[PDB]
């Protein structure tokens, strides 16, 4: 026992769990990572290739040799928030840069925020849309000619 080759292959499943659209771990044929899968048809694999690469060295697609089905892999979202905080307040204002507010209220934060809008810079939470007004000096400069007052 516990030294050799006649191994029991069960406590190491290999199911059809290629669940697209979400972020998941992967251990594909030796290579480890996390990513987002998406089903596709591919025309370039031969009978000895199961991973797709680029010249930088990133793994960008694969082919499950259990189902003969091809998929593409995307990186999972990582980022920061920009908090515009005025003194003696109780909570800052939040900018998720380059993100739609549907993506923010669905996939990032489920916490109660009654105020949000989709600005040119991203998604603004805890602030009113008042771009018709204008100001000549601002402490909280957000970029591209916008400001928080």
């Amino acid at each position: 026992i516990n030294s050799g080759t006649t191994c029991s292959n069960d406590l190491l499943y290999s199911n059809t769990e290629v669940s697209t659209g979400v972020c998941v771990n992967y251990d594909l044929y030796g290579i480890t990572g996390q990513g987002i899968f998406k089903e596709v048809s591919a025309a370039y694999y031969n009978n000895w290739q199961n991973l797709l690469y680029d010249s930088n060295g990133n793994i960008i697609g694969f082919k499950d040799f259990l189902t003969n089905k091809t998929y593409t892999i995307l990186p999972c979202y990582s980022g920061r928030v920009s908090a515009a905080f005025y003194q003696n307040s109780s909570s800052p204002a939040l900018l998720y840069r380059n993100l739609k507010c549907s993506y923010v209220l669905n996939n990032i934060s489920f916490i109660s925020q009654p105020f949000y809008f989709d600005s040119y810079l991203g998604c603004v939470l805890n602030a009113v849309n008042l771009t018709s007004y204008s100001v000549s000096s601002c402490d909280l400069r957000m970029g591209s000619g916008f400001c928080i007052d």
Binding site: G4, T6, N9, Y29, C76, S82
Partner: protein
């Protein structure tokens, strides 16, 4: 704190599950292609085969042959499912009813 704009880290994504694939080296054993053999030997001249250097599991086995019991001894029934042994030596024969 003072007035300012700060770059605060948010927790962003957590991975849901695992995927796995390894395209195995050795060939399966097919114990159940031997345990469902036609010519069953009698308790005088029982057979024995030594299934070694292959891959196996238990669930396809014990549902592909019509089990009525599976005890163990010096073992725990879930310690099969993980480990890697060195050989397996299945010895079968038929049963006379009153003995």
């Amino acid at each position: 704190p003072n007035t300012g704009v700060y770059d605060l880290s948010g927790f962003t994504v957590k991975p849901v599950a695992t995927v796995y694939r390894r395209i195995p080296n050795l060939p399966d054993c097919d114990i159940d292609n031997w345990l469902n053999n036609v010519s069953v030997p009698s308790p005088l001249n029982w057979e024995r085969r030594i299934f070694s250097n292959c891959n196996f599991n238990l669930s396809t086995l014990l549902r592909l042959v019509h089990v009525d019991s599976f005890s163990c001894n010096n073992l725990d029934k879930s310690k099969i499912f993980g480990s890697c042994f060195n050989s397996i030596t299945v010895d079968k024969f038929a049963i006379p009813n009153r003995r």
